[PDB]
Amino acid sequence: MRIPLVGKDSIESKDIGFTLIHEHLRVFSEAVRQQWPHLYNEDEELRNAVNEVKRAMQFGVKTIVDPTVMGLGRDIRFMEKVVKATGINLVAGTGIYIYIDLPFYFLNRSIDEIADLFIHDIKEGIQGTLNKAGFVKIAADEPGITKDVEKVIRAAAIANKETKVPIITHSNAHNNTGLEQQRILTEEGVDPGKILIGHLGDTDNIDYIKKIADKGSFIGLDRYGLDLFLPVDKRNETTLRLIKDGYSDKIMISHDYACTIDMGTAKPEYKPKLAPRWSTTLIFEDTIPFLKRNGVNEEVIATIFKENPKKFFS
Amino acid sequence: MRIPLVGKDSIESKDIGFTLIHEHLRVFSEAVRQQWPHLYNEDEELRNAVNEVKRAMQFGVKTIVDPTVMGLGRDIRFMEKVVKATGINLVAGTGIYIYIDLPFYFLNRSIDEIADLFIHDIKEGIQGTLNKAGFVKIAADEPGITKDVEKVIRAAAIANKETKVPIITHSNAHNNTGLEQQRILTEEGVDPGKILIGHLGDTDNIDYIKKIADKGSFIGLDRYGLDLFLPVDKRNETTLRLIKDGYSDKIMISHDYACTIDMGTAKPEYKPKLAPRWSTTLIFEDTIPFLKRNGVNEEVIATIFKENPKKFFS
Ligand SMILES: [Co+2]
Ligand SMILES: [Co+2]
Ligand SMILES: [Fe+2]
Ligand SMILES: [Fe+2]
């Protein structure tokens, strides 16, 4: 009715239920998998995603929002198979994930041409299917807001204005890329309440995080388990502080888990050190119980995982 | 034997015949094509490649070397189809084409892991087929020798020392990247005679061009027709001067034509302005006749287009 779902009829935002706002079923580099397929195994990848999703559902997760887009190996037909096997509500997205420059395809191409690609995914469908994009994903990281990064941001604003789908971002918590994404998007006419600034939970700099929330956007405390960015304990402490300071209606929580990911950083012998407890269920095992025994009312849990995602997609 | 060909038994390097050392059957950004297939037309692309190759063969071209690798949309099965329809000898390669950073896949991966990918293509086959790579292609441009660019250059050296296949490079004629590529490769123990420093025809600075030939590598006067980089008549005067100065033993000539290319810069609109006479038969129409009118004999032409490619692959 409003939010398109992979392999399902669209639904009203009020029916989204308990939601994980940022989780990846599978991530890979398009060019590498295309050039060297021997490196990948789809059977395992599907099995890994299906199993992970089933664990999440057993904890009550009703909807998963998967911001895998161009540059992370979005594959709508893979996503269909996971839904087919699990029955999860899956929201797919459109957009471009870059840190520095766009692919050469985009040389001498306008921001409008880029926005047109996103709009195609939202109105027509993804990768030749009738599965439609429910949001736009954009990124910026250590390199900052480069020329191409900015062009992609402004294209996302155009797509939002045309289709009203919200925007999810990837940012670096330590260099103000998040605040800049927000500024540019809102200058382009995007409603601040239609923006989730991502990976802000990677820092304990509470003052910076509040600055984005005060400007009306959702803040992504969304990498629970990725200790190399910030340990779980510190994340919980920051989350609790924000809630106590009255920021629960701006907070969104997730793991940014990748059921399978091809980056060398994700090698098995690195897990114990970088992300020992990383998964899509960590928050049920740690974060939520922690909050409840620290004076946080159930109503606040309901706000973060149900109400906020609802408003976001409304 | 010696040189592996797409869709054919390998051949002796002595039987390579008249060769175009740098031409592309098709170029595209892997990620863009994968995410937005609606932008592309396989049937038209095949038609374009087939017809162009046939025109080259009518002018005596026996072998085409196609340096389309990761980052340029290498597709071995598409290459097979063109071979079947034309009968051309086609040499495919392996390697990586980047200007700044490697794909995220390579985060926390060694230069050895990279080399292993090249050696896989050379020894086992490309993209799950039995078509083997006959050379390694690497690149550097305006941004210069970045850390990741340098990593790829060294992996190419490993692949060459292991398998003996030659290396073809892409460089920017104005920033010393070509000379730097040659230095790094030779320091790694690569035979200079197994290196083609590419795109040197983009400049008329013969002092710089000669510096590379003097160190033992082939020089790529390889973008005939691409006037936006350097107009035909200027390339001709440079080519002629080099021959007159005795450098025909290091000279290689080609067009770097792309029968189909998805970059905005290559739109049909811009062709008349940026590269009006660009194609795989330009050197037969203009360059070769021009050299002959200026006293260059048949032997020199045979040296450039038959003998040099032979040495390169020996
Ligand atoms: Co991210
Ligand atoms: Co090139
Ligand atoms: Fe993510
Ligand atoms: Fe080329």
Residue numbers in the entry:
A (entry chain B), B (entry chain A): 1 to 314
Authors' description from the paper:
Phosphotriesterase-like Lactonases (PLLs) are appealing candidates, being natural lactonases endowed with promiscuous phosphotriesterase activity. PTEs and PLLs belong to the amidohydrolase superfamily, and share the same (β/α)8 barrel topology. SsoPox exhibits high acyl-homoserine lactones and oxo-lactones hydrolysis abilities, and promiscuous, low phosphotriesterase activity. SsoPox is a very appealing candidate for the bioremediation of phosphotriesters because of its unique thermal stability, and its ability to resist aging, solvent and protease treatments.
Of them, the most active variants, αsA1 (C258L-I261F-W263A), αsA6 (F46L-C258A-W263M-I280T), αsB5 (V27A-I76T-Y97W-Y99F-L130P-L226V), αsC6 (L72I-Y99F-I122L-L228M-F229S-W263L), and αsD6 (V27A-Y97W-L228M-W263M) were subject to kinetic and structural characterization. Although the active sites of the improved variant structures superpose well onto the wt-structure, all selected mutants display altered loop 8 conformations. Notably, mutant αsA6 was crystallized in two different conformations: one in which loop 8 adopts a wt-like conformation, referred to as closed conformation (CC), and another one where loop 8 is unfolded, referred to as open conformation (OC). Interestingly, variants αsA6 and αsC6 exhibit enhanced lactonase activity against γ- and δ-lactones, while αsA1, αsB5 and αsD6 show reduced lactonase catalytic efficiencies. This emphasizes the fact that the improvement of the phosphotriesterase activity does not necessarily compromise the cognate, lactonase activity of the enzyme.
